[PDB]
């Protein structure tokens, strides 16, 4: 019943008597699987989690410079040299300035000038490698039949509840058997390696903000970088050397690139961190479902004899199905809920179909709530639930260096 | 002699008027028949009384963020913070249903508000064409040793050097050059750079000269110059991002420092510096018409130097092929005319090439006095022969996206 309310909802109908049903589980998407003489199960990929990520390269986006010195040479006296050029913590640039009799040279021409400054990084971003094996897919199951409106959004106590179940799929464990109590069990044979190619993807971390970027883009970033776990390569990206009318050379740092990186990241898939593990809200997972051990809990129940009352007004979902929530005054439970659509109330010939297969009242106590989903025909019809004189009827009617987009 | 050593050096040969274009980092050597060689350079452009126009925020922070949501067909969502101009808000439509807290399935109204505050800002200033001052430096050839090429201290007392100040309200000047007479300067200050279409931008103690149309197109939150004290920011949405989260709340997050992005956008703009309240400029040209009428040759009446000369420095070739010669005079017959020339054959001493320094002279009546002259030699082998008679000195020479527009 967890798919009820989801706009990206897919209704799959497996072959009658057939064992397998192929499903595509997307994030923010939901699959309602239906089969003849089988209960309706709602299957959804809830979370994709990446573990044991390793540092590859770190880019500096905010830097600072200190201990800046210069060395100059007269024309034809060769290139200028500072002992700081042999220091890997320093950023240097050679230029040509006008030299002469007033400048301290016996020759007129362009003299070599070198300026060095000690580079230090204030704020940095980190790129992490993703191993395909250290990837976990969490699937949530929910069975139709019983359960009221309050169970559509409930993830506390699925271990004790037979109607709801949690499934964990990894490339090392791509198969699972989900115990559904009286409903039997659902088999899940999934393809985790063919969901989102993580060999060409990196995990980027900024000021507590995370993304999933293409590896080729990350290696093309125009910022100072250091390998894994520092010696900064391409320090020139955050350092500017200003030449002053061929007389002097000044060195100044280029401010925070945080904003420029944020705007470049527009197009990349956003992510979040769950301590050490990385949470993902994008990507699909192809699964083959085993219907073999899936059974109808309540097929032996007798029809509900007492009166029903609508707790909520029957509502149309985004896909045209009707959700009905009813209260049962009877104590003859567990019993089969009489539910159908009718165009003519004299014959009561059933029109349309039921999404909720075998709707049942489980409690033996009175005033118990229950929810069912119907697929009505196009045009006018009547949602007729219950039997005899006390039956309730409701009239219904249907109808640059920007990141590329992943 | 101030142009000696400058790579961007122009040699103009003028007649009463001589038209010159004075650029920053450039130098003009003006030469004329029966007139002294004058070196003219535009040293500083200064802008005064600049007024604030608009201030753009490049680093912001958000606080006190709240949300309000409504079920489908229950109308638009409202927060009391939407009526507060210190808050940035966005209305959206989210999926609502039986699991979300609604009895109806459809798009429900959701509103999110956050208190906007600016941490760091930049300021744009208007430039009035009248509040603009140009400073020109003059230096005459004839006397002066090597040490005078770079000297700006006592130009008031020195006849060879002079300071000229040109403004749109005073575009003309008469520069007293002592014995050399005077140089007239009729300049065009208003057609130097067109400051009516330019603004003065100030960041983290960094200054630029930007086009006014570009500055008004900046995608950043802005407040008017007149909005003193507590400021009202227009277009706060430029630094604030609204991400869709769920049916009851929508996440709001600030975009981070745009300082680096503004710096990279400013690549192309003319850089400037501040001198307290006045703005210093190191770019732009100034067109001047020079009056040669009152300019005279100090030393035309002097007799030729009879004593011996000594080279203080080795004659050096400038970037343009001219030779600079610095000599010491042992004689006391000064003031006298320095005998200077180039020769291919020492028997006849027929002068080859030409002199850049017109009428080289020794001014002091005392011995061991230093002096510097500039020569333009012919191509190939020649001799820098200075002095007269037996004591003359000879030296062998040889020639040859919101990017700023």
């Amino acid at each position: 019943i967890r798919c009820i309310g989801v706009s990206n909802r897919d209704f799959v109908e497996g072959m009658s008597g057939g064992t397998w049903v192929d499903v595509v589980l997307e994030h923010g998407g939901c699959v309602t699987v239906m089969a003849q003489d089988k209960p309706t199960v709602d299957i959804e990929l809830v979370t994709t989690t990446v573990s044991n990520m390793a540092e590859v390269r770190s880019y500096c986006y905010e830097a600072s410079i200190s201990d800046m010195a210069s060395d100059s040479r007269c024309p034809t006296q060769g290139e200028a040299y500072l002992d700081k050029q042999s220091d890997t913590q320093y950023v240097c640039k050679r230029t040509l300035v006008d030299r002469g009799w007033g400048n301290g040279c016996g020759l007129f021409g362009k003299g070599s000038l070198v300026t060095c400054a000690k580079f230090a990084c204030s704020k940095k971003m980190t790129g992490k490698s993703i191993q395909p094996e250290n990837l976990e897919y969490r699937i949530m199951l929910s069975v139709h039949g019983s359960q009221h409106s309050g169970m559509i959004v409930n993830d506390t106590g699925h271990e004790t509840d037979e109607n709801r179940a949690k499934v964990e799929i990894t490339p090392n464990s791509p198969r699972a058997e989900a115990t559904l109590g009286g409903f039997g069990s659902l088999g899940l044979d999934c393809e985790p390696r063919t969901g989102l190619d993580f060999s060409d993807l990196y995990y980027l971390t900024m000021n507590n903000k995370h993304w999933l970027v293409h590896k080729e883009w990350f290696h093309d970033i125009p910022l100072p970088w250091h390998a894994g776990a520092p010696h900064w390569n391409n320090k020139e990206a955050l350092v500017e050397f200003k030449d002053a009318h061929a007389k002097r050379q000044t060195v100044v740092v280029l401010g925070s690139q945080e904003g420029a990186v944020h705007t470049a990241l527009a197009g990349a898939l956003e992510a979040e961190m769950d301590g050490a593990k990385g949470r993902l809200s994008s990507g699909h997972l192809k699964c083959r479902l085993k219907m073999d051990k899936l059974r109808l809990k309540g097929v032996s129940y007798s029809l509900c004899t007492a009166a029903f009352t609508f707790t909520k007004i029957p509502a149309e979902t985004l896909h045209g199905t009707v959700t009905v929530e009813v209260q049962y005054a009877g104590t003859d439970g567990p019993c089969k809920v009489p539910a159908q659509m009718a165009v003519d109330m004299q014959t009561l010939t059933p029109v349309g179909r039921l999404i909720t297969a075998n709707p049942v009242i489980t409690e033996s106590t009175e005033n118990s709530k229950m929810m069912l989903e119907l697929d009505p025909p196009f045009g006018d019809s009547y949602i007729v639930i219950g039997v005899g004189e006390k039956k309730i009827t409701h009239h219904w009617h249907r109808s640059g260096w920007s990141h590329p987009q992943f | 002699i101030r142009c000696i050593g400058v790579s961007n050096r122009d040699f103009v040969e003028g007649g009463t008027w001589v038209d010159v274009v004075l650029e920053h980092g450039g130098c003009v050597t003006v030469m004329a028949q029966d007139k002294p060689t004058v070196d003219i350079e535009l040293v500083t452009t200064t802008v005064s009384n600049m007024a604030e126009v608009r201030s753009y925020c490049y680093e912001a922070s958000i606080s006190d963020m709240a949300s309000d949501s409504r079920c489908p067909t229950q109308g638009e969502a409202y927060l009391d913070k939407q009526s507060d101009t210190q808050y940035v808000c966005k209305r959206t439509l989210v999926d609502r249903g039986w699991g979300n807290g609604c009895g109806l399935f459809g798009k429900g109204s959701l509103v999110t508000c956050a208190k906007f505050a600016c941490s760091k800002k930049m300021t744009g200033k208007s430039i009035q064409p009248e509040n603009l001052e140009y400073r020109i430096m003059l230096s005459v050839h004839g006397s002066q040793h090597s040490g005078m090429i770079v000297n700006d201290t006592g130009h008031e007392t020195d006849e060879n050097r002079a300071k000229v100040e040109i403004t749109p309200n005073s575009p003309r000047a008469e520069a007293t050059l002592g014995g050399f007479g005077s140089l007239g300067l009729d300049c065009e200050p208003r057609t130097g750079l067109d400051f009516s279409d330019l603004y003065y931008l100030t960041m983290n103690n960094k200054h630029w000269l930007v086009h006014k149309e570009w500055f008004h197109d900046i995608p950043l939150p802005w407040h008017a110059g007149a909005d003193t004290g507590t400021p009202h920011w227009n277009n706060k949405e430029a630094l604030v991002e609204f991400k869709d989260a769920h049916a009851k709340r929508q996440t709001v997050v600030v975009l981070g420092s745009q300082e680096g992005a503004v710096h990279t956008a400013l690549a192309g703009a003319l850089e400037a510096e501040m001198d307290g309240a006045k703005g210093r400029l190191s770019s732009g040209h100034l067109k001047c018409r020079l009056k040669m009428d009152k300019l005279r040759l100090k030393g035309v009446s002097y007799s030729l130097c009879t004593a011996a000369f000594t080279f203080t420095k080795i004659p050096a070739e400038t970037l343009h092929g001219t030779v600079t010669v610095e000599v010491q005079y042992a004689g006391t017959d000064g003031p006298c005319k320095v005998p200077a020339q180039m020769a291919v054959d020492m028997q006849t001493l027929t002068p080859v090439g030409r002199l850049i320094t017109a009428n080289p002279v020794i001014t002091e009546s005392t011995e061991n006095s230093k002096m510097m002259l500039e020569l333009d030699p012919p191509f190939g082998d020649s001799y820098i022969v200075i002095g007269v008679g037996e004591k003359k000195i000879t030296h062998h020479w040889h020639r040859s996206g919101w990017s700023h527009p």
Partner: antibody, heavy 133, light 110 residues
Framework: EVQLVESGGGLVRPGGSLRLSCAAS????????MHWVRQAPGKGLVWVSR????????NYADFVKGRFTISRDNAENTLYLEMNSLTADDTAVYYC??????????????????????????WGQGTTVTVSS | SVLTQPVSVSGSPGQSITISCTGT?????????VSWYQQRPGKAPKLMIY???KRPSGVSNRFSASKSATAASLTISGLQPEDEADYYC??????????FGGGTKLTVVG
């Protein structure tokens, strides 16, 4: 005429700090390199530091392992030597010195050319600094 | 570069004396850039020679200097009692730093 007058010398405790000052007059101060030289009692002259016209180049002897900072105020015709973490090894007469020769070659006093022609032609009388507990 | 000088030199009035300045980790440029300083008892040092052999104006013509690729030397001709002083040579230790020799005490005897 041309003179250099040092100040700020006196008794300082071991590990202490001191700021020496030098007043220059009779020459174009802003265009000259300035040096500090010291002489321990009964010992030889020891070069300490030099500074160019704008202060973009400040050089130090090996024994001044970042403990001293040379500086200048051109409009005030003043030279300074900020000294920290002083030891008995630093007890000496400190002389303020002008490089008059470099001015003849580079009248700007800016360019820090390697091994340039120099001459310490003007010396102050020196100020005594004693690093005594 | 480290500069070494004799500890002391003796001379009689009217005679000539030569003070050597030799370097370790030095080169021809070290000696090309040698400057010499005279320090009379209780007086501040005075520049006598710069650029290895150049004598500043005002300095007596009795002072001359020579240099080779291995040493620099100061020569005082026609020795006078006023020449009694400590003499120091100076040159570059590195491209950016200077160093003085240990000094030579010149005694004028008799």
């Amino acid at each position: 005429e041309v003179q250099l007058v040092e100040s700020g010398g006196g008794l300082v405790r071991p590990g202490g700090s001191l700021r020496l000052s030098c007043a220059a007059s009779g020459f174009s101060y802003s265009n000259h390199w300035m040096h500090w030289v010291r002489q321990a009692p009964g010992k030889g002259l020891v070069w300490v530091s030099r500074i160019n016209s704008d202060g973009s180049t400040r050089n130090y002897a090996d024994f001044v392992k970042g403990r001293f900072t040379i500086s200048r105020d051109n409009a005030e015709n003043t030279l300074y030597l900020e000294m920290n973490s002083l030891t008995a090894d630093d007890t000496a007469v400190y002389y303020c010195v002008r490089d008059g020769v470099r001015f003849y070659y580079d009248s700007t006093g800016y360019y820090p050319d390697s091994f340039f022609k120099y001459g310490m032609d003007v010396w102050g009388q020196g100020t005594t600094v004693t690093v005594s507990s | 570069s480290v500069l070494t000088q004799p500890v002391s030199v003796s001379g009689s009035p009217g005679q000539s004396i030569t003070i050597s300045c030799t370097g370790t980790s030095s080169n021809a440029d070290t000696y090309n850039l040698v400057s010499w300083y005279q320090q009379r008892p209780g007086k501040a040092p005075k520049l006598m020679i710069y650029e290895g052999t150049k004598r500043p104006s005002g300095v007596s013509n009795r002072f001359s200097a020579s240099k080779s690729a291995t040493a620099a030397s100061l020569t005082i001709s026609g020795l006078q009692p006023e020449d009694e002083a400590d003499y120091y040579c100076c040159s570059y230790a590195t491209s950016r730093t200077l160093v003085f020799g240990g000094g030579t005490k010149l005694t004028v005897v008799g």
